[PDB]
Design a protein around this ligand. Sequence first.
Ligand SMILES: [Mg+2]
Length: 282
Amino acid sequence: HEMEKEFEQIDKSGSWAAIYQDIRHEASDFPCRVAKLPKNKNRNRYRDVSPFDHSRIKLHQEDNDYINASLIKMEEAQRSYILTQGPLPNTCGHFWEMVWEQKSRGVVMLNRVMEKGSLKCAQYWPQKEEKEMIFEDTNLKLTLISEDIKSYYTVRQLELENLTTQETREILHFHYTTWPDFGVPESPASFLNFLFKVRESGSLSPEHGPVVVHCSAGIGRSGTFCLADTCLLLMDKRKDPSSVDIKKVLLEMRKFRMGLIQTADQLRFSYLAVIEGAKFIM
Ligand SMILES: [Mg+2]
């Protein structure tokens, strides 16, 4: 591989910081007028992280249609993802309305609810079978049916019911529970095993709505997930897999949501995950 020796070169020169700065400078800037309306102030977890108007997900019920979520439609890779912030105590109803309305089958969570003793996401799913959640604003019920708890991630079977129609769906909740408190994983092996399990589930199939991916702001770890998955798809489809340019792919993604990949260490980690995943995509 070359991005393999190309990885070596960037490591060698200590230019991750510079390459990452270049991405920030080159990234698209589109308007986020709706996210910034006064009435949406309490629907944003971070004032500095907003969906662009052109790609935001719109809620369908008769109220206010806004949720901080973006559709990332990766044209060449042929896969779409919704990236969204960790829901707030007042937007869990909206979050599950989005999953229903967009026909998602999987939700991918990349943080723990509390990290370093600080809350990063509301408890937006039920931890106990007998204590289901009812979101009275959006008329949805959510029940934990089972979970498969593993050392580095947990997969939950959730039943989401539209209480208006009594229709139900099974939603798979893929929760990577072991991202470090500071920095990125030393090795991408667990992250890749996690991604491959999400893939294996069918949750990323074009038969279903886009997978919902989140972390706390929905741009950093979430960025890393969608970037690695898309690069690996492009290296599998493209006539010559060495032509896939991770910085170009990330700029393409950032036409859909700002800020994806939040640090130079995250950008390095994405490269490393894609290089290692490729060996596995053998
Ligand atoms: Mg119990």
